[PDB]
Design a protein around this ligand. Structure first.
Ligand SMILES: *[C@@H](C)[C@H]1/C(=C/c2[nH]c(/C=C3N=C(/C=C4\NC(=O)C(CC)=C4C)C(C)=C\3CCC(=O)O)c(CCC(=O)O)c2C)NC(=O)[C@@H]1C
Ligand SMILES: *[C@@H](C)[C@H]1/C(=C/c2[nH]c(/C=C3N=C(/C=C4\NC(=O)C(CC)=C4C)C(C)=C\3CCC(=O)O)c(CCC(=O)O)c2C)NC(=O)[C@@H]1C
Ligand SMILES: *[C@H](C)[C@H]1/C(=C/c2[nH]c(/C=C3N=C(/C=C4\NC(=O)C(CC)=C4C)C(C)=C\3CCC(=O)O)c(CCC(=O)O)c2C)NC(=O)[C@@H]1C
Ligand SMILES: *[C@H](C)[C@H]1/C(=C/c2[nH]c(/C=C3N=C(/C=C4\NC(=O)C(CC)=C4C)C(C)=C\3CCC(=O)O)c(CCC(=O)O)c2C)NC(=O)[C@@H]1C
Ligand SMILES: *[C@H](C)[C@H]1/C(=C/c2[nH]c(/C=C3N=C(/C=C4\NC(=O)C(CC)=C4C)C(C)=C\3CCC(=O)O)c(CCC(=O)O)c2C)NC(=O)[C@@H]1C
Ligand SMILES: *[C@H](C)[C@H]1/C(=C/c2[nH]c(/C=C3N=C(/C=C4\NC(=O)C(CC)=C4C)C(C)=C\3CCC(=O)O)c(CCC(=O)O)c2C)NC(=O)[C@@H]1C
Lengths: 160, 169, 36, 160, 155, 161, 160, 161, 161, 161, 160
């Protein structure tokens, strides 16, 4: 969280957290309520969001389900949907934490070679993340969606 | 580095002056435009890689020889190096737009570019041309977006062009 | 013995193609074609 | 500046600005109005603040102003007041910037060595800054006093 | 010496090899009109649908692949092929069919093998280098090294 | 500066000795090579501007260096580049005639890299142009005279690099 | 620009800008709209002005495309036309800025030395610039044709 | 030196293309500011000596700088300080007219720091004097023209820093 | 660094075409000379200490260089000169086996002039020493490989000059 | 470290004896199998990523370790595990080319067991991944090369155990 | 050995063996039979080589065998002959390995200080290795003797 980032910076400088860092921590503590609200809304509306995202992505990419793709088996299609669920869970974790650290340490660092080892196309997965973010933004309110969007955008950045 | 607030603070500290009315006005202007700066930064963060790809996919048609043999993007290695440089430019433009100051643009981009690019034989003209193409794409995207203020976006790319370009006249 | 005469021997001259206009001057090439 | 710190943290990882750092930047820009109100109060009250703090210091610690003290004499007293003015100006810079980096860079790096060279009691200087904090916090609302107290306390800690 | 004869032979009918690859890969006309074994799932590409510029790019890239294969055989190491191929698949997939590229590369390998077919000591190297090329091309673009800034000072 | 004769003379002088057998041998070798050196110098003098012309043509024409924004774009910049190549050709010819590379250090290389660094000039591109100058000179000069001229031009390239 | 020329002369004489120089700058800043109009007209006729000028130049000097000429072959003729376009662009920049210095520093200083190395006839290039001038006069109004013809004639004189 | 117009044309020519709409936008903005720039320049030119007189009276006069042992003590050094203030005002006027500090970088801030260091010129005193010049000029020319001039004066000051 | 193979391929690629008619000529010549050059390199590696011994005996020993006041006077400077001679022999071998002196440029001539001028090493004495090394190696390896190594040794000598 | 030849030499040398018949025929066998080892190593290096990919696919894909809670769940942990498997493959290839297993203890088995214990890595799952690597490499290279590779792979697994 | 050096270089470079390195390994393996034959000849002629080298060394350098040296009576000569046999066996090991790695590891490092401690002239031991070289070369065929010389002279240089 932002608390972790501030305390890590203070430890690195061998000093206590500064005034600006303390005020940022205070602001994050204040906005924790909307962070929580992000949490319940995403958690309880994942299923429609994930279904719409998967259908849109596979319509745009008629290869993985098609011959010569990656998700022939139901075990593979369920795996792609599981990856959506895990990504959106990580996004909720990161929004609740306030920064990108949970996403970074759970499903961001090394994910490119993660899916190279499995032959899942990184551009395909980044397109999937784009459609998932679009679905989440459409399903969330305007200010709520604006707050949630940067984390999905950063995930897209790190993916490609 | 130094954002606009830091550079104004340094300027007034130089003469040992308290923050006067003009200093307060400039600070207020930066603080009011901070919302538009953050919005543009969010937009460019969302569309960074695609913007750079489009910039290259127009720049190499503007200068076809940069992908022909003996051009400095011929290999896939060279092509990825060119893309990395353009992504560097976009990232530092984002940083400069949020900072409202080109000091970061000078400290971490321009202070050795001609040295490095001449050492590697990399042209310094197509580089700025691609930078300006990136700026035009960014401006068009921001204008399409609901950004009330977007004039500040042209500042970092223009400073890049001015500092990294050759003094033709 | 004389097979080692790589550099000390007469150098093998190469061929350097004279530089020519490229696709960056396609507009001018077409202008020349129509000015034909 | 908080903008400086966030941009530097981003560049140290080579990524674009993270959502958390953008949140911090937005909070800083929103609070900029209160920052300027506090800073303008400080600069308008610079004469009164410095005068009252100097009077309090010269009363609490008469040794520094007594003969044989560093501040003894008209010129030495004027220079002590000028240093108080310098630190008040640095406090204003930190208030405007939302952090203590300008205070650190201008008047808190090597201050111990400089005042050792000049023969000044660093604890006395810290006491002067603390009195400046009290006088200034007496001239503003509760929240603004707490806001300026962070910069004042940072100077106190760096001096003692 | 043997590497030199390999290069001379392949350069001798580079046009033939690229033509026989292009005709096999692309459908709907003559790929050679404006030249500059395990098909997984591909579909032949219409020349008119692909267009002049895109077809020019594809043909140039096939000939270039043959050219670096000869260069790598002459040099003796697949480092050139690896460095110039390991990431090209992602940059190429955006407007170029990976399946068509794979079948074209396999066509090139088979054409080289059938045309040369001299000896294992003279042909297994060619087979090895096309196999390394195909593996590198099939490999997805790897992540970049990230020299993180040691502190706030250093980017 | 110093030619080969001057170098041998200076070595003997600094040691305070008369010209011994080895000095005579070195002088005899230079005298053996002298007529070919004169022939190459005359040829290059006859074809001075031409050689630079085809050198730039094989190297820098229709390129990013000569595009707008490059360091050779403007007419004045192109003239400056031509002047640099003219100096390089003339001084390589002088070095070839003298049999020594000391003239290059005395005149050209003593500050030229700092000059180009302050000018922003691309050392890689100028080295490419000089490298092309090597073959353009070799074609008109022969084989062994070409080797000598290439040696002095490689000295120039090493100094710039 | 005319401002640059006036500033340079004033600096050379170690004095402020003359009242007459200031009046000239005033007139130029007022007529900036018109000069922008001429620049836009030339930029519009860029791909036709040079084409027509090349037509006239080739019909006047057949040697250029004739065997042995500097521009023999379509590639060399295209290079000739690219120089044509470069000179027209320089004229555009000069008329916009109000000063010949942007013209001279790009395509007039040392041009004879630059073109001697290429073997091109300087007199031929000057005749080409002339033909461009008549094409512009045809595709321009009366007075503004004279205004641009001043700079065209300057280029012609300094080249021929 | 590069003014706004030459800066725009330079950015255009290093790209090789004609002035598009944005270039004309920048040029029209500069021409719009031109009338205010010229008015400020003429007023400053007329009130050249008086502004320096007021600045010296405000900052340096009756101070340790102008008393014995100060670098503005001797008559020759007083005249040199006055001439330097005239340089600052005139080159500020040039930068105001040109819309850029390129002339300041080329001529004013070109070796100035170590020039004053070698001569012994008090950097803080000269910076305060330049600030006084900026204040007097802003008072005499107006809020907007004063701020515009003070931008270049502060550029000179920060460069001296 | 680079070798003849990479130089040929670089030329071929920059021209954009395959190894058509002369790239393969140079390549076949290089491969033909490869075995003899490898044998020469092995002989030089075996005789490395010896070759330096006869070279120092011929050129530097019993001279003002070795006497007091010379740059090869003290034991440390003697060892440094011997190590430099080994460096020259090793990089001559590298250039011989790679077919190009670009290794000499990047690793030997990159800062050779700077280091030697800064230290005070006699350029003429070093050149004489390298000539003695070349002669000893040519005697010990044969006239053919002797000349083949001597071209790179003379490149180093010219760079020193 | 050592190899087959080095190991037989050391075995003779500890008794200080010349190469007897046993050492002779062991060297004969190693020399005979060297071609097979080179072929298998070349194949493994050519297809190196594929072996690790298939081994993980048939070993830990859709598995408890990949499940959250295990040591294989996160993307970072998965990348670390695949890197460990790739290095184990490379060291097995080094051992097979060498003909001696001491290299594994030298470079790998020094502290991997205790470091995995400190990090809480499942040693049983590590051994299973090593075994799956065994079958993948055996299938890809051949039974003759497969057994030879599996000898060192089993050495690695036993050391980790 | 060549294989040892290849593995060490491959580890230092962090990758498998290149095609050229595999080629050199293959060539070394092919020539292993020939080198093993060379060592077979050496081990067949081991005793006579040592005897002739020893007596030739004693004849050429009487100081070693004369009073004042390290060769006294029978025991010192026997110890020197044991050392000579050790070095011959080391040369045979180098011949079979195709690399001087076994010689260096068993004895080539610290030999200087060891003979310094024992008073043995390193120049004398290098000379003795020399006479071993000539005797072995005479006992073997000329082209065969090339590699034996290429190792003997390495040993002599290291022991110089
Ligand atoms: C008895 C001393 C041993 C001996 C001597 C010997 N030395 C040489 C040649 C040289 N000796 C030196 C040594 C030094 N020069 C220095 O400046 C220093 C420090 C003051 C030292 C130790 C040098 C440099 C030489 C090279 C010759 C020259 O001076 O120019 C020789 C001649 C060797 C030859 O073949 O030329 C000899 C004989 N020899 C013995 O056997 C004694 C053990
Ligand atoms: C005979 C060689 C001449 C001579 C030599 C001499 N050299 C030094 C010191 C140095 N020489 C070098 C050169 C190199 N080091 C490298 O790594 C390379 C490429 C591989 C080169 C060319 C360097 C770097 C030094 C200094 C650092 C070092 O110890 O290596 C000295 C010592 C000078 C001193 O007084 O310190 C000497 C004497 N001396 C002669 O008289 C011969 C003409
Ligand atoms: C599609 C079936 C075929 C194809 C078409 C194609 N290529 C590009 C763009 C590029 N192709 C390359 C090629 C190479 N890079 C190398 O290093 C080598 C040797 C290994 C080659 C052959 C590169 C670098 C590019 C990008 C730069 C460029 O324009 O050349 C395109 C254009 C894509 C776009 O417009 O964005 C197309 C349509 N390439 C193949 O390989 C297929 C046979
Ligand atoms: C056309 C009217 C005449 C003509 C032209 C011609 N020019 C060239 C080649 C070049 N021309 C230039 C000139 C400029 N470059 C600049 O940047 C500027 C200012 C913007 C000028 C004036 C240059 C630099 C070249 C070099 C080519 C290159 O850039 O690569 C040619 C061809 C030369 C060749 O060898 O191909 C020609 C034919 N020739 C005529 O006969 C006409 C009278
Ligand atoms: C009196 C006879 C005339 C006169 C004098 C006057 N002077 C000033 C102010 C200054 N005079 C000087 C002159 C010098 N300083 C030096 O060091 C030397 C050389 C050794 C000289 C000649 C200076 C520097 C000043 C500036 C003020 C200062 O000293 O700080 C004034 C006051 C001007 C004002 O308005 O402040 C006056 C009146 N005035 C006359 O009318 C007499 C003819
Ligand atoms: C769906 C959007 C895409 C897709 C999916 C796909 N994934 C796999 C296999 C795996 N995916 C994961 C996922 C993760 N690993 C992590 O560390 C995290 C971050 C916390 C996640 C989300 C893992 C672990 C595997 C392998 C192990 C397992 O499945 O338990 C496959 C399988 C491919 C194959 O079997 O060959 C697929 C298909 N495929 C697409 O095409 C979409 C773009």
């Amino acid at each position: 969280s932002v608390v972790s980032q501030v305390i890590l910076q203070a430890d690195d400088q061998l000093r206590y957290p500064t005034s600006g860092e303390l005020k940022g921590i205070q602001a994050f503590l204040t906005t924790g309520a909307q962070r929580i609200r992000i949490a319940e809304t995403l958690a309880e509306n994942e299923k429609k969001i994930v279904d719409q995202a998967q259908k849109q992505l596979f319509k745009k990419h008629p290869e993985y389900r098609a011959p010569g793709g990656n998700a022939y088996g139901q075990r593979q299609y369920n795996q792609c949907l599981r990856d959506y669920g895990w990504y959106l869970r990580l996004v909720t974790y990161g929004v609740l934490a306030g920064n990108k650290e949970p996403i970074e340490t759970t499903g961001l660092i090394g994910v490119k070679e993660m899916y190279n080892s499995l032959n899942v196309p990184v551009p395909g997965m980044v397109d999937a993340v784009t459609v998932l973010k679009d679905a989440a933004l459409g399903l969330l309110s305007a200010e709520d969606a604006n707050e949630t969007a940067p984390y999905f955008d950063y995930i897209i950045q790190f993916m490609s | 580095m130094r954002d606009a607030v830091t550079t104004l603070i340094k300027n007034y500290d130089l003469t040992g002056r308290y923050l006067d009315r003009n200093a307060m006005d400039e600070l207020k202007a930066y603080f009011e435009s901070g919302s538009a700066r953050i919005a543009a930064a969010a937009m460019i963060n969302a569309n960074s890689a695609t913007i750079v790809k489009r910039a290259a996919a127009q720049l190499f048609e503007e200068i076809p020889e940069l992908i022909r043999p003996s051009g400095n993007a011929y290999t896939t290695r060279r092509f990825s190096a060119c893309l990395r440089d353009m992504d560097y430019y976009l990232r530092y433009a984002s940083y400069a737009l949020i900072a409202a100051d080109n000091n970061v643009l000078d400290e971490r981009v321009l202070q050795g570019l001609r040295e490095t690019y001449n050492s590697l034989g990399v042209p310094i003209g197509p580089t700025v041309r691609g930078i300006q193409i990136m700026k035009e794409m960014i401006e068009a995207m921001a204008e399409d977006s609901s950004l009330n203020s977007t004039d500040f976006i042209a500042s970092p790319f223009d400073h890049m062009t001015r500092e990294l370009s050759e003094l033709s006249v | 013995p004389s097979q080692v005469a790589f550099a000390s021997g007469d150098p093998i001259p190469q061929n350097v193609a004279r530089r020519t206009p490229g696709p960056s001057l396609n507009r001018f090439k077409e202008m020349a074609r129509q000015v034909k | 500046s908080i903008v400086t710190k966030s941009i530097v943290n981003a560049d140290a990882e080579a990524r674009y600005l993270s959502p958390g750092e953008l949140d911090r930047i937005k909070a800083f820009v929103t609070g900029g109005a209160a920052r300027l109100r506090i800073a303008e109060t400080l600069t308008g009250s610079r004469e009164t603040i410095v005068k009252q703090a100097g009077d309090r210091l010269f009363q609490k610690r008469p040794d520094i102003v007594s003969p044989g003290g560093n501040a003894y004499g008209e010129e030495m007293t004027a220079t002590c007041l000028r240093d108080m003015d310098y630190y008040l100006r640095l406090v204003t810079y930190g208030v405007v910037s939302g952090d203590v980096t300008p205070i650190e860079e201008i008047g808190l790096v090597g201050v111990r060595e400089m005042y050792r060279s000049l023969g000044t009691p660093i604890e006395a200087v810290a006491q002067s800054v603390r009195e400046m904090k009290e006088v200034a916090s007496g001239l503003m609302s509760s929240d603004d006093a707490a806001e300026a107290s962070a910069y004042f306390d940072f100077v106190i800690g760096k001096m003692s | 010496a043997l590497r030199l004869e390999i290069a001379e032979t392949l350069t001798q009918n580079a046009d033939l090899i690229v033509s026989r690859a292009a005709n096999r890969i692309f459908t709907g006309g003559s790929p050679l009109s404006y030249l500059e074994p395990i098909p997984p799932g591909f579909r032949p590409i219409n020349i008119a649908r692909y267009g002049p510029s895109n077809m020019q790019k594809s043909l140039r890239d096939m000939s270039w692949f043959l050219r670096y294969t000869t260069y790598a055989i002459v040099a003796g190491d697949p480092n050139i092929i690896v460095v110039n191929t390991r990431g090209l698949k992602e940059v190429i997939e955006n407007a170029c069919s990976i399946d068509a590229t794979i079948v074209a590369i396999q066509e090139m390998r088979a054409a080289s093998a059938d045309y040369f077919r001299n000896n294992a000591q003279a042909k297994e190297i060619v087979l090895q280098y096309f196999d390394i090329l195909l593996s590198e091309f099939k490999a997805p673009t790897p992540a970049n090294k990230v020299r993180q800034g040691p502190s706030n000072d250093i980017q | 500066m110093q030619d080969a004769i001057t170098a041998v003379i200076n070595s003997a002088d600094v040691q305070g000795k008369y010209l011994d057998g080895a000095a005579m041998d070195k002088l005899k070798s230079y005298f053996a090579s002298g007529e070919l050196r004169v022939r190459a110098a005359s040829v290059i003098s006859a074809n001075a501007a031409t050689i630079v012309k085809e050198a730039v043509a094989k190297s820098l024409l229709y390129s990013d260096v000569t595009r707008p924004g490059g360091n050779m774009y403007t007419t004045r910049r192109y003239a400056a580049c031509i002047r640099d190549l003219d100096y390089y050709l003339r001084y390589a010819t002088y070095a070839m005639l003298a049999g020594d590379a000391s003239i290059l250090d005395e005149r050209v290389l003593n500050g030229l890299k700092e000059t180009y660094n302050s000018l922003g000039v691309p050392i890689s591109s100028t080295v490419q142009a000089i490298q092309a100058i090597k073959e353009v000179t070799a074609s008109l000069v022969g084989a062994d005279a070409g080797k000598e001229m290439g040696v002095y031009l490689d000295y120039i390239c090493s100094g710039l690099s």
